[PDB]
Every structure is written in structure tokens, then in C-alpha cells.
Amino acid sequence: FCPPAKVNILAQSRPLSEWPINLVSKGVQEYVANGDFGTSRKSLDRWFARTGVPTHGYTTVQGLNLILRHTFNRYDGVIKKVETRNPGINPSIYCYQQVSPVPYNPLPLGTPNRLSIPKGQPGYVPEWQRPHLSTKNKRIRKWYARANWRRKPGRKSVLDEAKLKEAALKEAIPIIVTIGKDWIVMDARGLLRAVYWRGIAKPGLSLKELLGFFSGDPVLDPKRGIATFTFKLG
RNA sequence: CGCUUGCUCGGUUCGCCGAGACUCCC
DNA sequence: GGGAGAATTGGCCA
DNA sequence: TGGCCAATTCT
């Protein structure tokens, strides 16, 4: 079993459902045809351009075997499900080996000390009571974590999109997925928490060693602003 | 042994701390 | 209600 | 030479 993972995107060149891989994978399900489907580029040429369905400058052998082969199983199986008892046009951009994520180019502990920060600076712990806390090696939420600023009738807060949210991109961990013209930068601290949650120690993890524990084929979601990874057999 | 993002739920001096899952998608 | 790889290889110009 | 982007593969 491959456990899942969930990471947040940061920036995109153009609107989500406007990349040409999506513009190719979208019409396939509507179309489904010849049936001349093969990994070989020659067979792929025949199935797509020749049969009739338009291609938006896409010819990758993997990028057309992860959407055509999926669609036929989408048009099938449900018939088998109709047989078993006796639809959505997914822009789920299934990334492949050739577009595997790599860390950004032109691990830190975070807050090294909990009860030690100069007074008045951001992150400073309160003075009315420093003791009476708990020390069981639980997760540490950073001061800017909006999970700690949620609104309720009993809660008091002054939410600002700059003070709270812009503080994230300062110490973010960028990784890049490139299909040739479209670039997506996701936040890897989700992967950090996912790997520390299952048992792996801290500090031995660096660049080129976090992504290794996850599968190299993400499933980007050009809606909800989220991406999803999977681990390996380990 | 060990824990930067997301989310659910509390009160608080408003500075911040206490508990929890991650098999998610159509 | 279905999917969540990446090893080996073949063209390959500075 | 070797180095990288695509192209081919089984279960």
C-alpha cells in the first residue's frame, strides 16, 4: 500500500485549467476512436491526430498513455459495474517520470526554542504563564499558522492577509514541477510533517532525501489549490 | 527517538497554549 | 465508483 | 565522450 500525502501549490503561470495537457485530456473523455492504442509513438499518432481528436502541441509518450489508457478504463469498468450489479471530466494532471519534482533553484528546525524569544518580537511566548504546558513531543504550530487563529464567538483576533499569510512564503520549501512551459511550485512542509508523522527521525532529512520517500508521480489538482503525493512501498 | 504548511475543536492577559486523523480523490 | 513507477534504453550534439 | 530528453516496459 502507498500512503497518500497532500501539499499546497503557490504560483502558476496561467489559470489552472488552461495548460495544454489539460486542454488535451479534457476532450478525450467526451470523445470516448479507431482503437489503435499503443505505447509506440506511431500508434499514438494514429489514435489521436489521424482519427480526428485535436492535440494541443502534445506528443509525450507518457503524457498520452496516462490519459488515453485511463479514459478507456473510465468508459469501461462502469459497464462492468453495470455487469457487476447484473463521468466527470477530470483535469487530474497525472504527472509522470519525465516531470518528477525537484527542489527549487534560482532541514531547519523552525523555531529552535519555544520558551525563549525576546519580548515583543513576533512569536514571543506569553508572560502571564510560561509553565503549565505539556512536553510530550507534540507537533509545534508556528505563530503564523492560521489553524491557531480560527474565528469563534469566544475567540478574539484581528485577521490580516499580509501579517498571517505572507509570513509563510518567507521560510517555505519550494519544489518545482515543469512540463516544459508550465511551472508549479508547491509547499513541501506538508511532506516534512508527513514524514515526521510516521516515525522517521529529524535532521538526517535534507534536500534530495525528502522527495525520495514519496513517489515521483504526483497527481496535481487544478482546483482546490492542492496537490497529492504517494509514498513508496516503505 | 523525534514534528515549519492544511484542517477539526477550546478558553485565554490577544502576546498564545492545550487535544486529533490522515486511504485522498473522482 | 477507478488510479496514484521508474528501470532500461535510444537518439544524441558541444 | 557523455549527457540529457524522450521513448519503451512489464506485472
Side-chain angles (χ1 to χ4, degrees):
Chain A
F1 174 77
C2 294
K6 195 90 67 133
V7 302
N8 298 317
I9 61 178
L10 294 190
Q12 60 182 359
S13 288
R14 282 249 84 206
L16 328 122
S17 286
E18 195 176 0
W19 303 320
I21 176 165
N22 195 24
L23 294 179
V24 167
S25 172
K26 171 177 179 55
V28 182
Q29 173 49 12
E30 310 157 356
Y31 196 64
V32 187
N34 281 13
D36 194 12
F37 175 69
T39 61
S40 59
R41 250 316 294 178
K42 299 299 294 298
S43 184
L44 281 173
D45 195 24
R46 296 193 54 90
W47 202 96
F48 227 72
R50 271 97 276 267
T51 304
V53 43
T55 157
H56 298 254
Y58 218 84
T59 40
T60 316
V61 176
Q62 271 149 338
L64 311 173
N65 280 323
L66 268 74
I67 60 171
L68 295 175
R69 178 180 61 191
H70 262 117
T71 295
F72 263 80
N73 220 339
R74 287 219 298 258
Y75 199 55
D76 287 326
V78 286
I79 303 299
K80 278 80 175 176
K81 185 63 200 62
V82 164
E83 177 259 345
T84 300
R85 57 172 185 89
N86 198 15
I89 314 289
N90 282 300
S92 288
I93 306 182
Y94 281 101
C95 286
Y96 37 80
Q97 171 165 51
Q98 294 179 176
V99 292
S100 178
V102 293
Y104 180 87
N105 68 320
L107 298 194
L109 180 59
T111 54
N113 317 103
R114 188 192 291 263
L115 324 172
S116 164
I117 279 171
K119 170 177 178 301
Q121 301 182 356
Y124 165 61
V125 294
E127 187 75 19
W128 57 292
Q129 63 84 60
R130 286 203 170 190
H132 297 286
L133 314 179
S134 65
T135 57
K136 212 68 176 176
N137 198 344
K138 61 186 284 184
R139 183 198 158 190
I140 172 161
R141 298 190 302 265
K142 182 97 178 190
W143 70 273
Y144 78 83
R146 66 165 318 272
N148 215 359
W149 295 62
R150 45 184 298 277
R151 61 182 67 250
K152 268 294 182 179
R155 291 240 211 186
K156 303 282 309 311
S157 61
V158 291
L159 170 61
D160 293 316
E161 208 70 19
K163 301 311 161 303
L164 187 153
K165 192 255 289 180
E166 189 265 304
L169 293 99
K170 180 190 307 297
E171 62 177 11
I173 300 172
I175 58 176
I176 46 168
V177 173
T178 294
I179 321 182
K181 220 239 121 351
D182 307 320
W183 61 270
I184 287 302
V185 174
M186 328 174 274
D187 219 343
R189 298 168 281 189
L191 300 168
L192 268 72
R193 195 203 68 170
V195 61
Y196 301 137
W197 183 257
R198 214 69 40 81
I200 296 178
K202 181 266 290 180
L205 280 71
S206 185
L207 75 164
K208 319 315 293 195
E209 293 179 353
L210 174 83
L211 313 179
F213 290 97
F214 319 106
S215 298
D217 301 337
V219 183
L220 312 185
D221 199 349
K223 67 184 289 184
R224 298 170 53 170
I226 49 174
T228 284
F229 280 72
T230 43
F231 288 70
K232 287 194 192 203
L233 272 298

mmCIF file with all atom_site columns, all heavy atoms in Angstrom, chain A residues 213-227:
data_model
loop_
_atom_site.group_PDB
_atom_site.id
_atom_site.type_symbol
_atom_site.label_atom_id
_atom_site.label_alt_id
_atom_site.label_comp_id
_atom_site.label_asym_id
_atom_site.label_entity_id
_atom_site.label_seq_id
_atom_site.pdbx_PDB_ins_code
_atom_site.Cartn_x
_atom_site.Cartn_y
_atom_site.Cartn_z
_atom_site.occupancy
_atom_site.B_iso_or_equiv
_atom_site.pdbx_formal_charge
_atom_site.auth_seq_id
_atom_site.auth_comp_id
_atom_site.auth_asym_id
_atom_site.auth_atom_id
_atom_site.pdbx_PDB_model_num
ATOM 1   N N   . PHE A 1 213 ? 11.255  9.621  -0.395  1.00 0.00 ? 213 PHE A N   1
ATOM 2   C CA  . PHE A 1 213 ? 10.295  8.764  0.285   1.00 0.00 ? 213 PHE A CA  1
ATOM 3   C C   . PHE A 1 213 ? 8.931   8.769  -0.393  1.00 0.00 ? 213 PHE A C   1
ATOM 4   O O   . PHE A 1 213 ? 8.119   7.878  -0.126  1.00 0.00 ? 213 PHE A O   1
ATOM 5   C CB  . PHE A 1 213 ? 10.150  9.187  1.747   1.00 0.00 ? 213 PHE A CB  1
ATOM 6   C CG  . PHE A 1 213 ? 11.363  8.898  2.582   1.00 0.00 ? 213 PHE A CG  1
ATOM 7   C CD1 . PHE A 1 213 ? 12.303  9.883  2.830   1.00 0.00 ? 213 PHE A CD1 1
ATOM 8   C CD2 . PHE A 1 213 ? 11.561  7.640  3.125   1.00 0.00 ? 213 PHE A CD2 1
ATOM 9   C CE1 . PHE A 1 213 ? 13.416  9.618  3.599   1.00 0.00 ? 213 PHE A CE1 1
ATOM 10  C CE2 . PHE A 1 213 ? 12.677  7.369  3.892   1.00 0.00 ? 213 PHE A CE2 1
ATOM 11  C CZ  . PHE A 1 213 ? 13.602  8.359  4.131   1.00 0.00 ? 213 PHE A CZ  1
ATOM 12  N N   . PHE A 1 214 ? 8.666   9.739  -1.262  1.00 0.00 ? 214 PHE A N   1
ATOM 13  C CA  . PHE A 1 214 ? 7.398   9.843  -1.966  1.00 0.00 ? 214 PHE A CA  1
ATOM 14  C C   . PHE A 1 214 ? 7.564   9.422  -3.418  1.00 0.00 ? 214 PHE A C   1
ATOM 15  O O   . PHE A 1 214 ? 8.646   9.525  -4.000  1.00 0.00 ? 214 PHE A O   1
ATOM 16  C CB  . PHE A 1 214 ? 6.844   11.269 -1.893  1.00 0.00 ? 214 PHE A CB  1
ATOM 17  C CG  . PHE A 1 214 ? 7.018   11.916 -0.552  1.00 0.00 ? 214 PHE A CG  1
ATOM 18  C CD1 . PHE A 1 214 ? 7.971   12.900 -0.362  1.00 0.00 ? 214 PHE A CD1 1
ATOM 19  C CD2 . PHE A 1 214 ? 6.235   11.533 0.523   1.00 0.00 ? 214 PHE A CD2 1
ATOM 20  C CE1 . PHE A 1 214 ? 8.135   13.491 0.874   1.00 0.00 ? 214 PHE A CE1 1
ATOM 21  C CE2 . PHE A 1 214 ? 6.395   12.122 1.754   1.00 0.00 ? 214 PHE A CE2 1
ATOM 22  C CZ  . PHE A 1 214 ? 7.347   13.099 1.934   1.00 0.00 ? 214 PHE A CZ  1
ATOM 23  N N   . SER A 1 215 ? 6.483   8.956  -4.022  1.00 0.00 ? 215 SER A N   1
ATOM 24  C CA  . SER A 1 215 ? 6.506   8.576  -5.420  1.00 0.00 ? 215 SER A CA  1
ATOM 25  C C   . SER A 1 215 ? 6.793   9.780  -6.262  1.00 0.00 ? 215 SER A C   1
ATOM 26  O O   . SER A 1 215 ? 6.378   10.896 -5.943  1.00 0.00 ? 215 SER A O   1
ATOM 27  C CB  . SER A 1 215 ? 5.172   7.976  -5.848  1.00 0.00 ? 215 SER A CB  1
ATOM 28  O OG  . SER A 1 215 ? 4.886   6.802  -5.117  1.00 0.00 ? 215 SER A OG  1
ATOM 29  N N   . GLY A 1 216 ? 7.486   9.554  -7.353  1.00 0.00 ? 216 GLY A N   1
ATOM 30  C CA  . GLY A 1 216 ? 7.867   10.622 -8.247  1.00 0.00 ? 216 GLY A CA  1
ATOM 31  C C   . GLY A 1 216 ? 6.795   11.071 -9.206  1.00 0.00 ? 216 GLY A C   1
ATOM 32  O O   . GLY A 1 216 ? 7.059   11.925 -10.056 1.00 0.00 ? 216 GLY A O   1
ATOM 33  N N   . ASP A 1 217 ? 5.582   10.523 -9.093  1.00 0.00 ? 217 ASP A N   1
ATOM 34  C CA  . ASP A 1 217 ? 4.463   10.841 -9.976  1.00 0.00 ? 217 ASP A CA  1
ATOM 35  C C   . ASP A 1 217 ? 3.345   11.454 -9.140  1.00 0.00 ? 217 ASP A C   1
ATOM 36  O O   . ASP A 1 217 ? 2.492   10.734 -8.601  1.00 0.00 ? 217 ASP A O   1
ATOM 37  C CB  . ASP A 1 217 ? 3.965   9.600  -10.717 1.00 0.00 ? 217 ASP A CB  1
ATOM 38  C CG  . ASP A 1 217 ? 5.043   8.943  -11.557 1.00 0.00 ? 217 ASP A CG  1
ATOM 39  O OD1 . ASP A 1 217 ? 6.017   9.629  -11.928 1.00 0.00 ? 217 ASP A OD1 1
ATOM 40  O OD2 . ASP A 1 217 ? 4.913   7.737  -11.849 1.00 0.00 ? 217 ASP A OD2 1
ATOM 41  N N   . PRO A 1 218 ? 3.317   12.776 -9.007  1.00 0.00 ? 218 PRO A N   1
ATOM 42  C CA  . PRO A 1 218 ? 2.223   13.423 -8.278  1.00 0.00 ? 218 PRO A CA  1
ATOM 43  C C   . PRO A 1 218 ? 0.952   13.459 -9.109  1.00 0.00 ? 218 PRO A C   1
ATOM 44  O O   . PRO A 1 218 ? 0.939   13.158 -10.304 1.00 0.00 ? 218 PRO A O   1
ATOM 45  C CB  . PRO A 1 218 ? 2.760   14.830 -8.015  1.00 0.00 ? 218 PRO A CB  1
ATOM 46  C CG  . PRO A 1 218 ? 3.694   15.073 -9.141  1.00 0.00 ? 218 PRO A CG  1
ATOM 47  C CD  . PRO A 1 218 ? 4.336   13.746 -9.439  1.00 0.00 ? 218 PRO A CD  1
ATOM 48  N N   . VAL A 1 219 ? -0.137  13.832 -8.450  1.00 0.00 ? 219 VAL A N   1
ATOM 49  C CA  . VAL A 1 219 ? -1.440  13.987 -9.094  1.00 0.00 ? 219 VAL A CA  1
ATOM 50  C C   . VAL A 1 219 ? -1.901  15.407 -8.788  1.00 0.00 ? 219 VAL A C   1
ATOM 51  O O   . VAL A 1 219 ? -2.569  15.660 -7.782  1.00 0.00 ? 219 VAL A O   1
ATOM 52  C CB  . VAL A 1 219 ? -2.460  12.953 -8.614  1.00 0.00 ? 219 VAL A CB  1
ATOM 53  C CG1 . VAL A 1 219 ? -3.777  13.115 -9.361  1.00 0.00 ? 219 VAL A CG1 1
ATOM 54  C CG2 . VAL A 1 219 ? -1.910  11.544 -8.781  1.00 0.00 ? 219 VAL A CG2 1
ATOM 55  N N   . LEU A 1 220 ? -1.546  16.347 -9.658  1.00 0.00 ? 220 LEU A N   1
ATOM 56  C CA  . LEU A 1 220 ? -1.919  17.734 -9.432  1.00 0.00 ? 220 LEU A CA  1
ATOM 57  C C   . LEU A 1 220 ? -3.419  17.915 -9.621  1.00 0.00 ? 220 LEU A C   1
ATOM 58  O O   . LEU A 1 220 ? -4.036  17.278 -10.479 1.00 0.00 ? 220 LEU A O   1
ATOM 59  C CB  . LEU A 1 220 ? -1.155  18.655 -10.381 1.00 0.00 ? 220 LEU A CB  1
ATOM 60  C CG  . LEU A 1 220 ? 0.352   18.441 -10.507 1.00 0.00 ? 220 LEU A CG  1
ATOM 61  C CD1 . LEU A 1 220 ? 0.962   19.516 -11.389 1.00 0.00 ? 220 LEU A CD1 1
ATOM 62  C CD2 . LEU A 1 220 ? 1.016   18.430 -9.138  1.00 0.00 ? 220 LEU A CD2 1
ATOM 63  N N   . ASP A 1 221 ? -4.004  18.792 -8.812  1.00 0.00 ? 221 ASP A N   1
ATOM 64  C CA  . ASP A 1 221 ? -5.429  19.107 -8.899  1.00 0.00 ? 221 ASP A CA  1
ATOM 65  C C   . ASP A 1 221 ? -5.593  20.576 -9.253  1.00 0.00 ? 221 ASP A C   1
ATOM 66  O O   . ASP A 1 221 ? -5.462  21.448 -8.375  1.00 0.00 ? 221 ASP A O   1
ATOM 67  C CB  . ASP A 1 221 ? -6.142  18.786 -7.588  1.00 0.00 ? 221 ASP A CB  1
ATOM 68  C CG  . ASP A 1 221 ? -7.639  18.651 -7.761  1.00 0.00 ? 221 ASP A CG  1
ATOM 69  O OD1 . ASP A 1 221 ? -8.145  19.014 -8.841  1.00 0.00 ? 221 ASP A OD1 1
ATOM 70  O OD2 . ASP A 1 221 ? -8.311  18.190 -6.816  1.00 0.00 ? 221 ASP A OD2 1
ATOM 71  N N   . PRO A 1 222 ? -5.878  20.908 -10.513 1.00 0.00 ? 222 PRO A N   1
ATOM 72  C CA  . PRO A 1 222 ? -6.086  22.313 -10.881 1.00 0.00 ? 222 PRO A CA  1
ATOM 73  C C   . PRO A 1 222 ? -7.450  22.821 -10.442 1.00 0.00 ? 222 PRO A C   1
ATOM 74  O O   . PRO A 1 222 ? -8.163  23.493 -11.194 1.00 0.00 ? 222 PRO A O   1
ATOM 75  C CB  . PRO A 1 222 ? -5.946  22.301 -12.407 1.00 0.00 ? 222 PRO A CB  1
ATOM 76  C CG  . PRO A 1 222 ? -6.336  20.931 -12.798 1.00 0.00 ? 222 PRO A CG  1
ATOM 77  C CD  . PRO A 1 222 ? -5.861  20.029 -11.691 1.00 0.00 ? 222 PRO A CD  1
ATOM 78  N N   . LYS A 1 223 ? -7.807  22.485 -9.209  1.00 0.00 ? 223 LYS A N   1
ATOM 79  C CA  . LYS A 1 223 ? -8.900  23.063 -8.443  1.00 0.00 ? 223 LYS A CA  1
ATOM 80  C C   . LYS A 1 223 ? -8.606  22.752 -6.985  1.00 0.00 ? 223 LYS A C   1
ATOM 81  O O   . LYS A 1 223 ? -7.887  21.794 -6.686  1.00 0.00 ? 223 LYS A O   1
ATOM 82  C CB  . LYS A 1 223 ? -10.267 22.508 -8.862  1.00 0.00 ? 223 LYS A CB  1
ATOM 83  C CG  . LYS A 1 223 ? -10.481 21.040 -8.549  1.00 0.00 ? 223 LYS A CG  1
ATOM 84  C CD  . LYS A 1 223 ? -11.817 20.551 -9.089  1.00 0.00 ? 223 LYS A CD  1
ATOM 85  C CE  . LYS A 1 223 ? -12.977 21.118 -8.290  1.00 0.00 ? 223 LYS A CE  1
ATOM 86  N NZ  . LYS A 1 223 ? -14.288 20.572 -8.739  1.00 0.00 ? 223 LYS A NZ  1
ATOM 87  N N   . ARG A 1 224 ? -9.202  23.535 -6.081  1.00 0.00 ? 224 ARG A N   1
ATOM 88  C CA  . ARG A 1 224 ? -8.978  23.374 -4.633  1.00 0.00 ? 224 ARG A CA  1
ATOM 89  C C   . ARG A 1 224 ? -7.562  23.774 -4.255  1.00 0.00 ? 224 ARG A C   1
ATOM 90  O O   . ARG A 1 224 ? -7.215  23.791 -3.075  1.00 0.00 ? 224 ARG A O   1
ATOM 91  C CB  . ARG A 1 224 ? -9.366  21.979 -4.121  1.00 0.00 ? 224 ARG A CB  1
ATOM 92  C CG  . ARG A 1 224 ? -10.839 21.655 -4.308  1.00 0.00 ? 224 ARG A CG  1
ATOM 93  C CD  . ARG A 1 224 ? -11.142 20.198 -4.009  1.00 0.00 ? 224 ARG A CD  1
ATOM 94  N NE  . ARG A 1 224 ? -10.660 19.796 -2.692  1.00 0.00 ? 224 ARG A NE  1
ATOM 95  C CZ  . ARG A 1 224 ? -10.959 18.638 -2.114  1.00 0.00 ? 224 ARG A CZ  1
ATOM 96  N NH1 . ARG A 1 224 ? -11.755 17.778 -2.729  1.00 0.00 ? 224 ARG A NH1 1
ATOM 97  N NH2 . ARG A 1 224 ? -10.475 18.346 -0.914  1.00 0.00 ? 224 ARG A NH2 1
ATOM 98  N N   . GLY A 1 225 ? -6.745  24.106 -5.251  1.00 0.00 ? 225 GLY A N   1
ATOM 99  C CA  . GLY A 1 225 ? -5.391  24.565 -4.983  1.00 0.00 ? 225 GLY A CA  1
ATOM 100 C C   . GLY A 1 225 ? -4.551  23.595 -4.183  1.00 0.00 ? 225 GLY A C   1
ATOM 101 O O   . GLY A 1 225 ? -3.760  24.010 -3.336  1.00 0.00 ? 225 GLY A O   1
ATOM 102 N N   . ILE A 1 226 ? -4.711  22.305 -4.447  1.00 0.00 ? 226 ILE A N   1
ATOM 103 C CA  . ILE A 1 226 ? -3.972  21.296 -3.700  1.00 0.00 ? 226 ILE A CA  1
ATOM 104 C C   . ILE A 1 226 ? -3.326  20.277 -4.608  1.00 0.00 ? 226 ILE A C   1
ATOM 105 O O   . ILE A 1 226 ? -3.758  20.084 -5.743  1.00 0.00 ? 226 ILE A O   1
ATOM 106 C CB  . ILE A 1 226 ? -4.867  20.533 -2.698  1.00 0.00 ? 226 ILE A CB  1
ATOM 107 C CG1 . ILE A 1 226 ? -6.142  20.038 -3.383  1.00 0.00 ? 226 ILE A CG1 1
ATOM 108 C CG2 . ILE A 1 226 ? -5.196  21.395 -1.488  1.00 0.00 ? 226 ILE A CG2 1
ATOM 109 C CD1 . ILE A 1 226 ? -6.999  19.153 -2.507  1.00 0.00 ? 226 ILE A CD1 1
ATOM 110 N N   . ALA A 1 227 ? -2.271  19.640 -4.126  1.00 0.00 ? 227 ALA A N   1
ATOM 111 C CA  . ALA A 1 227 ? -1.635  18.584 -4.891  1.00 0.00 ? 227 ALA A CA  1
ATOM 112 C C   . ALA A 1 227 ? -1.574  17.392 -3.959  1.00 0.00 ? 227 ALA A C   1
ATOM 113 O O   . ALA A 1 227 ? -1.667  17.554 -2.744  1.00 0.00 ? 227 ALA A O   1
ATOM 114 C CB  . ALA A 1 227 ? -0.247  18.997 -5.340  1.00 0.00 ? 227 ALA A CB  1
#
